[PDB]
mmCIF file of C-alpha atoms and ligand atoms in Angstrom:
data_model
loop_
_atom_site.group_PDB
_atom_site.id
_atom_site.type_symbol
_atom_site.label_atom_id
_atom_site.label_comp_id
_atom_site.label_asym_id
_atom_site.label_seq_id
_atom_site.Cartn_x
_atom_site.Cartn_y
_atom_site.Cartn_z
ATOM 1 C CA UNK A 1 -83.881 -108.242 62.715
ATOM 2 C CA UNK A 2 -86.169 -108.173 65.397
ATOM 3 C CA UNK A 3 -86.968 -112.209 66.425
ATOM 4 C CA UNK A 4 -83.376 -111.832 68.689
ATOM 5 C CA UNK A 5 -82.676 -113.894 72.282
ATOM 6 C CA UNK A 6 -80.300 -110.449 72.919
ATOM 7 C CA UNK A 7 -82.506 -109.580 75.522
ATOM 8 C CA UNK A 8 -85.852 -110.394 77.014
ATOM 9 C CA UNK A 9 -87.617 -108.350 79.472
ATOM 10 C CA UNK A 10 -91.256 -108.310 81.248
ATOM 11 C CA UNK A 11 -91.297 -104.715 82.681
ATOM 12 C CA UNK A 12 -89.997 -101.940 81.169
ATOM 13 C CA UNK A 13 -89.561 -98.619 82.565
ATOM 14 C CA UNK A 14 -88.736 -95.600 80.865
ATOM 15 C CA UNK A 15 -88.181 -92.141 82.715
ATOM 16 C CA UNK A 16 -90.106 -88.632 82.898
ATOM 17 C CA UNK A 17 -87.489 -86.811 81.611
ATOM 18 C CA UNK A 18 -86.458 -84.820 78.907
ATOM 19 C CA UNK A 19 -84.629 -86.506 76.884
ATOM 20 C CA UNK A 20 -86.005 -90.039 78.293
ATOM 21 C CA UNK A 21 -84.161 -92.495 80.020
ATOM 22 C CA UNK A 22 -84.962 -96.174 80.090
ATOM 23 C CA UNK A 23 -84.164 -99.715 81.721
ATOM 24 C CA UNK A 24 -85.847 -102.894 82.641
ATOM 25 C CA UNK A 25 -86.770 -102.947 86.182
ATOM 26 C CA UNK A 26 -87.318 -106.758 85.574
ATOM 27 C CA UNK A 27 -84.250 -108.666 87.221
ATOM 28 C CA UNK A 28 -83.365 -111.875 85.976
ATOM 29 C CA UNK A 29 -81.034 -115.295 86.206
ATOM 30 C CA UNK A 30 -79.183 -114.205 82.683
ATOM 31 C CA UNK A 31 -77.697 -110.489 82.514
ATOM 32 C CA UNK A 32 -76.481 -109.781 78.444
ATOM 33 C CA UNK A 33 -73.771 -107.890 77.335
ATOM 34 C CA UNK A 34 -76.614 -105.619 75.657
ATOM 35 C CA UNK A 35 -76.508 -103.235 78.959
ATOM 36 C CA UNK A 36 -72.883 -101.860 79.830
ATOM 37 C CA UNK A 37 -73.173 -102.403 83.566
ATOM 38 C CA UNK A 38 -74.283 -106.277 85.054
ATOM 39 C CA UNK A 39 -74.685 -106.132 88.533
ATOM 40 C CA UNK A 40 -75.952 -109.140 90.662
ATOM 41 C CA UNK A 41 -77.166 -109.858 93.932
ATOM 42 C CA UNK A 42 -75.907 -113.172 94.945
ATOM 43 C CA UNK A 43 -79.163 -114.903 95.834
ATOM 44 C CA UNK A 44 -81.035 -118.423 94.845
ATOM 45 C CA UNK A 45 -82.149 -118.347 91.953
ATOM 46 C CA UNK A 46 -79.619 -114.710 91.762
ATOM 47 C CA UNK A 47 -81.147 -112.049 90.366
ATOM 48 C CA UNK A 48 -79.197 -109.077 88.218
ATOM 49 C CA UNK A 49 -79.819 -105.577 86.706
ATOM 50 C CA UNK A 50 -78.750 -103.747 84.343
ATOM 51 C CA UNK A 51 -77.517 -100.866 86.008
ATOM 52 C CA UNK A 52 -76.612 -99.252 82.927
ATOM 53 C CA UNK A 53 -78.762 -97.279 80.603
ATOM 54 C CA UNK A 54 -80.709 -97.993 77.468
ATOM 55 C CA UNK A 55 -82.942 -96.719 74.860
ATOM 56 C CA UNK A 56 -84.809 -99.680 73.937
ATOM 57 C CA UNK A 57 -87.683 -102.281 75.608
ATOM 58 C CA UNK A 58 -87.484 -105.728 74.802
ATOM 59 C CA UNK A 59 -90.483 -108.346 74.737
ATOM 60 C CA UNK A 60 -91.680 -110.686 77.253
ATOM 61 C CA UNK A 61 -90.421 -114.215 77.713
ATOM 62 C CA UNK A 62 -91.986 -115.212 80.972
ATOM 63 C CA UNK A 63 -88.934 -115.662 83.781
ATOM 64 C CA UNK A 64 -91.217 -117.430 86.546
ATOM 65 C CA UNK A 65 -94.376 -118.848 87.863
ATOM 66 C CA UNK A 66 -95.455 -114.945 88.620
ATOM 67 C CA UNK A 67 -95.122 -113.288 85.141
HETATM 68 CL CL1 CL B 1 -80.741 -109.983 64.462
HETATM 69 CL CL1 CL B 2 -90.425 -115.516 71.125
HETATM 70 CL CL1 CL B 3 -97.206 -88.365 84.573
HETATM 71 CL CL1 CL B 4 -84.533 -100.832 90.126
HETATM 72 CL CL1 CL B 5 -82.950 -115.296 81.773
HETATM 73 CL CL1 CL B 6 -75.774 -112.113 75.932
HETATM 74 CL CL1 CL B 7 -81.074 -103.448 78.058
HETATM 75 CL CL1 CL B 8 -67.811 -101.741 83.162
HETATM 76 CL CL1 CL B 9 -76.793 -112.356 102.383
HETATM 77 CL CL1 CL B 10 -78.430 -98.387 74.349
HETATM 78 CL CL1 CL B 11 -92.641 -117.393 77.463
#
């Protein structure tokens, strides 16, 4: 499907490259097991990227009172 909580994401940001690259620059609370590599910075409320690599964007479900 296409309707799935895997991930959500509010920026995107995919590479000038050839092939492309891509990865969501948006950090958030929850880091899924859809990117290989979940790194997070401690902090309050913590905030966590995924360092790995992916082909894909995911849709926006609005994290905080900013976005
Ligand atoms: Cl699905
Ligand atoms: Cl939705
Ligand atoms: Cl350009
Ligand atoms: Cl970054
Ligand atoms: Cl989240
Ligand atoms: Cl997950
Ligand atoms: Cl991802
Ligand atoms: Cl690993
Ligand atoms: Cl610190
Ligand atoms: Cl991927
Ligand atoms: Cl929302």
């Amino acid at each position: 499907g296409d309707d799935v909580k895997s991930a959500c994401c509010d920026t995107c940001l995919c590479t000038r490259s050839q092939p492309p690259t891509c990865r969501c620059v948006d950090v958030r609370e929850s880091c899924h097991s859809a990117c290989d590599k979940c790194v997070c910075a401690y902090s309050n409320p913590p905030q966590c990227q995924c360092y790995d690599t992916h082909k894909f964007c995911y849709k926006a479900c609005h994290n905080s009172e900013i976005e």
